[PDB]
Design a protein around this ligand. Structure first.
Ligand SMILES: O=NC1=c2cc/c(=c3/nc(C4CCNCC4)[nH]c3=C3C=CNC=C3)cc2CC1
Length: 127
């Protein structure tokens, strides 16, 4: 049921920046979501083989998860905050594509997304 390689968390030829907004995304946004009671499905790439979701990566062609995001932030992988925000948005939207309203995974994504947006609304202005 083979899994694809997980998304990269480093890329030496990719140009990178550190910004106060990206630091906030790690210290506040990622850390807050990571500790949540509904974080567990999202702390690592979907193991479609072991979870018996054989069509997961047949439907989801741009997978993303908070384990990947956490390592990207720790590795200063991003050029700007928007790039990181895009990864969270991909993670949530993949759930809404793969699953139906009311599925536990969707309820979890929705709760995390609500919290994510609350924290993003307080993103500091870039210094
Ligand atoms: O859109 N579908 C998604 C989906 C489906 C299932 C899971 C999921 N992930 C796990 C992990 C938890 C840690 N141990 C390895 C397995 N376990 C599960 C799991 C197991 C049983 N029931 C629900 C989820 C994670 C996700 C993220 C997006």
């Amino acid at each position: 049921s083979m899994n694809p390689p997980p998304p990269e968390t480093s890329n030496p030829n990719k140009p990178k920046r550190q910004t106060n907004q990206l630091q906030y995304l790690l210290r506040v946004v990622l850390k807050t979501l990571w500790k949540h009671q509904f974080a567990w499905p999202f702390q690592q790439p979907v193991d479609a083989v072991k979870l018996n979701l054989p069509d997961y990566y047949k439907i989801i062609k741009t997978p993303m998860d908070m384990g990947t995001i956490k390592k990207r932030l720790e590795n200063n992988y991003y050029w700007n905050a928007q790039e990181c925000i895009q990864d969270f948005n991909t993670m949530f939207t993949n759930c809404y594509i793969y699953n139906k309203p009311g599925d536990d995974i969707v309820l979890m994504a929705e709760a995390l997304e609500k919290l994510f947006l609350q924290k993003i609304n307080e993103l500091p202005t870039e210094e």
